[PDB]
Design a binder for this molecule. Structure first.
Ligand SMILES: [Ca+2]
Ligand SMILES: [Ca+2]
Ligand SMILES: [Ca+2]
Ligand SMILES: [Ca+2]
Lengths: 223, 67, 223, 67, 223, 67, 67, 223, 223, 67, 67, 223
């Protein structure tokens, strides 16, 4: 996260890391068997790392659990990035405790102005690269569809919303995709795309989770 | 770390596709993608991808990094 | 520089690096024997380094000359940072070439809105720390002293001017001090102080060089 | 690089001068300075300096790093 | 150009005409705001004419933008014509399109034998005068500094290179100065001087652009 | 005397070729000439001439006078 | 076009400076310059300039033209 | 003359003043109708003033004779200043007397160390300007061509000799050109050029008259 | 190890890695809280890493335990490297299992010719440098003290023994120090020193553990 | 990795101590040590050490590397 | 004078390398060197050196001073 | 020197002080621009101080000259301390006079029993520290190789000799290295090493200069 802060060890127990030899995406835990991430993060043989603060150091209470199933939303558009949401079933259940916990799906779409928590292990620089060891967090309000469509003219769908600041400076970046966007103790968004990082008038674009609670509930029961 | 060459600062000022060719030529593990700077970028991290960011004129205005 | 761009090798031939084992401050060459910097970078036994892009690699076009004399402005205030300017005499003259040249001292002060080039080897992140191997640059307009006093209430002198953006995101940082602030081909400012880096409503604060041309001209003749 | 320990993230949430003390007894090279974030900061780089940035309550609200 | 061909309208979209009542020098567009020309073409109150083929007939799709700033290379020598390079800033940005485009600066110097495109509205006669209405083009190889120093004994700096034919017949002429010399898609030379036009053993002398990318790159940022 | 302005102490420190343009801009009767000081100067007197003397760096280091 | 007389074919065979004098006397818009065939010429265009090209002896061996 | 003494009223009766609304060059009288000067003092319509002391005050014993003819040496090179010599034919002859007299041509070149007299109405300061009302003179030894070629590397031809002092302080200056340099009662040199006035290691440069007696002798016979 | 094979993940479960930002020395676990290494691997603030194969990639089954106490043999001589043995107490006990285990102390000195296993993450080249990601191993016979003192005249103590090959080509190298030399399932030697790596007639020199079992047994009981 | 310069192939053929001086002058993080290759070398790895290996002549006969 | 702590009389009686450690921790300007007392000693003066003189058993039998 | 006497101001005119912030070693002047010292005193950027007594008080009559070149003997061994000799060229020649003079190199070696002058600014106590205000002197006899190797068994080369008393009490100490040891007018030895200061049976070991006249005479010409 560009312009964020140090969260502290396991202050975000539902933040999980997607691993393919390296960290390539973030993820949210919804139960002891399923992870909510972005559709464009789909790979072959994903490894899920749960309960971790430092990705370059073994903490002691981590859980490395393989992916046995990955399901992309059928209406996911590869170009418009519409319906950018994917569920990942864990091969074995995860031991839920303090360090490792899930997060509740929303029952209502949050309104513009609601302060959200954005978390991840992405790039921490608007220009150049700086990949952290420790998990980075950020506080960021929800922006209006007016502003969100002003930013990206004709690129915002019904399943998307912008968060961050029109001023810039603070934003999610490369390596944060699939990461959680939490509002009022419930998961509202997913780190999707944008134009660069922390750029003026181009805030972060996030997948609207409240439009997929039904599909999430249906997918878990079916698989 | 990612395998091979990571950055191409010397390719700033070249035309996008020439840069793409050179990039794939020097690091046979990446897929160079030429894009405009006002277009959208996904926020995933890949060791096999090198964005070649250009502007309206198709010239590289940003250092092609492996992300 | 936070939120800047890679200038390229020797795009800024007048940029100099103050050394004492490590690069601690920046400076600007005014003639083949003298370097202007900030007074708070005053050390004992400085080694000035000219013609350097990568400060971690010996590229070949580099001059490492010891400082023989260092002079702080008599009215320098360590507390209010008023008159934060210092002249430095090179033990011997430097070979002026394409890689190493001096810069012209201004005729008059620049106006608010003038696009200026700020360069340095300082920190490159809003929060946290990451230091570049290569010299960094950034364009920034001079701001009104109404905005400069609004940003820093009762801390701005008639020898200080603010530059950058009150949006934040782009600003000079730690390790850029004494660095050149060039406008319309002439050295208008000296990287001095601020409150953090690239913070909202608090841009960069720089020493006004158009007030010291007389002392600068006098010091080289007297010393 | 600079000698000794460079960052003290575990001291976030502690009181400024306590942090200063511990920091100084851990790194014998640095002079710890407790300062308010509302205040102004010089833009030099020192290996013998650790800013203990505090707010209006005197608590460390940012990681003390050697800069 | 003496003994060249008719280019065709806007086949050289980066060729610009320096105007002050009449056409006196040529130029090359490098970005939407800057034109590279020759230093000896320096005048006050210059009007740049972009996207033109017939300079005496208003075709439409022509841009007449006044010069706001003009900077001669500091080390320019009026007697040896060394460092014969000047940068011109436009009062406003030019509309880039099909007929008005810029040209890339070289990343290296070329070899002897490299075929280059020389373009201009200069004289088209070996002896006498007959100035064209339409822009004229020519293709000429780069000559070795052996031939260049043999042709011009003690008048060729390391900032100069010869192009054309040791035979004669084809060459640039009066009114072509500041004009582009393009090789492999990049601007490597500037029409400077020579002894007569299309003369035996005395081809064209051109400013070596590859030695000024740094200054050209610095000038645009500082100004 | 000679017509127009005769002294330009203002342009000491400026680059020669801008100072020249300024000089001709102010005095319509003179032909400003930029010349290095290590070079050789003729010893005639002209009201139509203002020598703009510079050094290796191209900066004016003599007061441009009408001589 | 340029103002005044453009070509001086009658001055071919004369000494350079007398020819220069006549050229300036007939066209008040030009500055006649006596140069050698041997020498080098800038390739700009000026209505305020008439090159008087001479050879080994200082005689005009080319029709003075306003270029 | 810089660092000279007051000659006194017409102690140099062969010194003539070239006029055209103001004094611009000097010269020497060789006979009733002819005057030797420097070639670079050429103007259209010169008015020769003989028998002068105070050029700003009409004293009575003066003669204002217009030039009817002006002849520059055919080999005069404007760039290298070689053969900087010119003859002037007065419209009518002058009354030779106590205050108007001519000087004799040389028959052999003088050697180094010979004390010569140099007169004129030129500038009288090394830096700054202070033009005299009364004619100024100076005694100066002839410097060896070794010292002369040392002072001016590859700029001294077979037709040039240096005079003055390697120390400096005393030298001819701007407004002395065409002026006489007489030795043992005969005109040896013509005030030509130099590098500033009275500067160190750069003395006065003077046209070697002894190489042109044939040309002067022939020019008055043919014209 | 120079000229060794890839051990495979955790085939040497008693191999520990001394860390301090980078891998600098090796070691051998003797019980839950104690590690044997070489005395010249002494540092302030050692972090022991157990259960390691790839020291650059976090695998999952590894324990990073800080050092709390470091004890050098009282008779250790930095000059002659005699008594080059050190005991490091871990801040907390390690979880002994399949991948993390200790090795048994020797009860008698092994003979010359006994095939021993040498392990480490050291340099893998005689001339030049190429550091491996994966732990390296090698089988080497114990050499006679005759050959050992012949290879190193008057430098071998009764606390030292040579292993490797008189031929060369295969030997321990830089980064293997403190490393284990186990024979018949018991720690017999410690990677100490030599003359380069895998050089002819100058094999590896290792610390004789069978002389210090009493020391290690006392030290662990007293500290 | 290790900070600063890592390899000095340029200093082969030089006298050991001058080369050592050059090494410490270029890389402030290392302590250069001149040693004869007939002697024994410890097998630890240090980012703060450059062995300047010489022979009986005193000439550097091995590339000074950071180990 | 030399910077920092100069003498360590309270370490007389401990072991060489523990003493070395403590010395380096208290004075970041010195490099502690454990030396035997019957060994050879150069007679230079270094503010960056603290000899920790030991005997047959490896116990400090001499006050560690900055010399 | 431990147990010596106060020499008196400039009674040892060839004694020079090596300074790099503080006095760290002694030395001897051999000519206008060269100083002989010990090899283990090698620093980078040495400043030589000639004509001194009170090194803490500027008395005038002193010369502080930067070291330009410094050459260690090629066969210098840092472990056996053999060939402990270094030459130092001064950037500029020193003014020779009453208080600043050079000293003769030996034509032969002195014998055992030859009384010699040892001089320096080193420590003056056998146990503890007490550094002098004033240059200290001492007269000590040269000892036979028998007593020298009986003192230091297998540590004495052919380039080393012992000087002092087997009783102890009087000896050169810490800070005297590089210092002159003169006999019958000529420099026979250089203060090098020993075992403690003024210790019984372990006197001063000094570099035998008579074996280096050739190298000293070769280096000053070759450099
Ligand atoms: Ca047209
Ligand atoms: Ca008069
Ligand atoms: Ca690992
Ligand atoms: Ca003194």
């Amino acid at each position: 996260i560009v312009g964020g802060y140090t969260c502290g060890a396991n202050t975000v127990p539902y933040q999980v890391s997607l691993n393919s030899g390296y960290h390539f995406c973030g993820g949210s835990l919804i139960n002891s068997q399923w992870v909510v991430s972005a559709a464009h993060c789909y790979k072959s043989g994903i490894q899920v790392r749960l309960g971790e603060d430092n990705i370059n150091v073994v903490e002691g209470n981590e859980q490395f659990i393989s992916a046995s199933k990955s399901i992309v939303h059928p209406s996911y558009n590869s170009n418009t990035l519409n319906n950018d949401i994917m569920l990942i079933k864990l091969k074995s259940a995860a031991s839920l405790n303090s360090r490792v916990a899930s997060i509740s799906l929303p029952t209502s779409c949050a309104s513009a102005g609601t302060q959200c928590l954005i978390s991840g292990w992405g790039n921490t620089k608007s220009s150049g690269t700086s990949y952290p060891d420790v998990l980075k967090c950020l506080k960021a309000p929800i922006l209006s569809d007016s502003s969100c469509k002003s930013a990206y003219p004709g690129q915002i769908t019904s399943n998307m919303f912008c968060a961050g600041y029109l001023e810039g400076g603070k934003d999610s970046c490369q390596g944060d995709s699939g990461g959680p966007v939490v509002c009022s103790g419930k998961l509202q968004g997913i780190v999707s795309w944008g134009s660069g990082c922390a750029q003026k008038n181009k805030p972060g674009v996030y997948t609207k989770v409240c439009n997929y609670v039904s599909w999430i509930k249906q997918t878990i029961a079916s698989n | 770390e990612c395998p091979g060459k990571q950055e191409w600062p010397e390719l700033v000022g070249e035309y996008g596709y020439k840069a793409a060719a050179i990039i794939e030529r020097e690091n046979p593990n990446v897929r160079s993608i030429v894009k405009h700077e006002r277009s959208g970028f996904t926020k995933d991290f890949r060791c096999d991808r090198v964005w070649v960011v250009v502007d309206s004129t198709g010239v590289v205005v940003r250092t092609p990094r492996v992300t």
